[PDB]
Design an enzyme around this catalytic site. Structure first.
Site, PDB file in Angstrom:
ATOM      1  N   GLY A  46      38.492  55.975  31.853  1.00 18.84           N
ATOM      2  CA  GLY A  46      38.615  56.853  30.665  1.00 18.84           C
ATOM      3  C   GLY A  46      38.675  55.886  29.504  1.00 18.84           C
ATOM      4  N   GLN A  51      41.139  53.780  20.961  1.00 22.48           N
ATOM      5  CA  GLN A  51      41.217  52.465  21.670  1.00 22.48           C
ATOM      6  C   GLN A  51      40.196  51.429  21.227  1.00 22.48           C
ATOM      7  OE1 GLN A  51      41.528  54.458  25.801  1.00 22.48           O
ATOM      8  NE2 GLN A  51      42.580  52.476  25.968  1.00 22.48           N
ATOM      9  N   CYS A  99      45.912  51.264  31.650  1.00 21.95           N
ATOM     10  CA  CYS A  99      45.344  51.531  30.362  1.00 21.95           C
ATOM     11  C   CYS A  99      44.734  50.214  29.911  1.00 21.95           C
ATOM     12  CB  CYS A  99      46.476  51.998  29.423  1.00 21.95           C
ATOM     13  SG  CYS A  99      45.972  52.447  27.744  1.00 21.95           S
ATOM     14  N   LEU A 100      43.479  50.255  29.507  1.00 25.87           N
ATOM     15  CA  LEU A 100      42.784  49.048  29.024  1.00 25.87           C
ATOM     16  C   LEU A 100      43.434  48.421  27.777  1.00 25.87           C
ATOM     17  CD1 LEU A 100      39.261  50.673  29.583  1.00 25.87           C
ATOM     18  CD2 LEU A 100      40.489  48.957  31.021  1.00 25.87           C
ATOM     19  N   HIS A 141      45.690  61.860  30.033  1.00 26.04           N
ATOM     20  CA  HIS A 141      45.984  60.502  29.562  1.00 26.04           C
ATOM     21  C   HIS A 141      45.135  60.134  28.325  1.00 26.04           C
ATOM     22  CE1 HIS A 141      46.511  56.045  30.407  1.00 26.04           C
ATOM     23  NE2 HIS A 141      45.476  56.075  29.589  1.00 26.04           N
ATOM     24  N   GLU A 142      43.847  60.482  28.349  1.00 27.70           N
ATOM     25  CA  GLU A 142      42.978  60.137  27.212  1.00 27.70           C
ATOM     26  C   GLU A 142      43.339  61.034  26.044  1.00 27.70           C
ATOM     27  OE1 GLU A 142      41.533  57.386  27.220  1.00 27.70           O
ATOM     28  OE2 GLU A 142      41.766  57.178  29.385  1.00 27.70           O
ATOM     29  N   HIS A 145      46.041  59.598  23.841  1.00 30.31           N
ATOM     30  CA  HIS A 145      45.619  58.651  22.769  1.00 30.31           C
ATOM     31  C   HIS A 145      45.250  59.329  21.473  1.00 30.31           C
ATOM     32  CE1 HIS A 145      45.498  55.111  25.085  1.00 30.31           C
ATOM     33  NE2 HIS A 145      44.610  55.602  25.929  1.00 30.31           N
TER      34      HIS A 145
END
Ligand SMILES: FC(F)c1nc2ccccc2[nH]1
Ligand SMILES: FC(F)c1nc2ccccc2[nH]1
Ligand code: NA
Ligand code: NA
Lengths: 171, 171
Positions: A46, A51, A99-100, A141-142, A145
């Site tokens: 994702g 991000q 998470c990236l 989760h996305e 953000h």
């Protein structure tokens, strides 16, 4: 074009992102294509626009095979603008997330097992899906953000938060 | 001898450590000397025995100049066994902490401004001090390791949790 993924601590991950208003445009399609590309190089499942320091209600996600979650089932390759989410039930379920923007780390996080999500494909057609388990977790989760929220503020059991190569908590 | 510092996610940071019972011994003095040495190579201000996978109620701390906290006042070089801590008041104070077991990251954490702490020097003489501000914070933070607790479970404002080289939260 592969874009820098900004890391936790950048104020830009903490904003409430405005809506996408350029559906069907060439700028959106380029930005989306950049996102899938960025997601892919970092082996993400994702990625949300904030991000990459783009302040918009937009996320990409999905894969066939995940290097990070070899046990997960395929989630369709999806670009979604102006995401809105509703739980289809009260049932919560714990699962591992990373998470990236927070490289090296993971935690167990409770999420709704069942959701509906709605918004738009980048060409502007409406998207509306019921999702469950990992598919649903990725989308929740996305979405977080897009409201300035990362997963640590959702951890309930801090025993499960640690570096990926050291953890041996058995979910 | 410099010892590996184990990283968050290792179960060994999550235990309640037993007391030190070899005060005045040559094994304790060697283990303490290893701790100061390990603390120093990693540029730490505090190190607790469970951070090197030694299950004991023991911590070292202190410095003249900190590379990490150039604004902090000197804290005396101290080795403390069987630490016990009591707040001298209810006043809390926020301050930045990190942790050699959670490299790269920091957060703002509330701690008591004023404590007393008691225990033993490694030669076995009793130590008993009133501490405040950063000195007190270091001791409270290292004590938390002796009970299986790291600083993320103490963060109240997740906006302040991020990587050290990216954060611009102004305390
Ligand atoms: F570690 C990262 F690849 C990553 N990104 C994610 C997005 C949603 C859920 C779990 C995730 N894990
Ligand atoms: F970043 C690390 F060097 C570190 N260790 C600490 C121990 C107590 C308080 C703050 C600290 N920061
Ligand atoms: Na915010
Ligand atoms: Na514990």
């Amino acid at each position: 074009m592969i874009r820098d993924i900004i890391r936790m601590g950048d104020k830009r991950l903490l904003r409430v992102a405005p809506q996408v208003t350029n559906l069907g445009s060439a700028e959106l399609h380029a930005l989306v294509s950049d996102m899938f590309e960025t997601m892919g190089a970092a082996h993400g499942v994702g990625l949300a626009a904030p991000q990459i320091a783009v302040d918009l209600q937009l996320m990409v996600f999905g894969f066939e095979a995940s290097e990070r979650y070899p046990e997960a089932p395929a989630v369709p390759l999806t670009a979604l603008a102006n995401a809105q989410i509703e739980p289809l039930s009260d049932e919560m379920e714990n699962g591992w997330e990373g998470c990236l923007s927070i490289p090296g780390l993971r935690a167990v996080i409770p999420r709704y097992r069942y959701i509906r999500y709605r918004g738009f494909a980048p060409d502007g057609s409406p998207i509306e899906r019921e999702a469950e388990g990992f598919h649903a977790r990725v989308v929740q989760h996305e979405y977080d953000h897009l409201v300035g929220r990362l997963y640590p503020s959702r951890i309930e059991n801090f025993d499960t938060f640690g570096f990926d190569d050291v953890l041996s908590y058995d979910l």
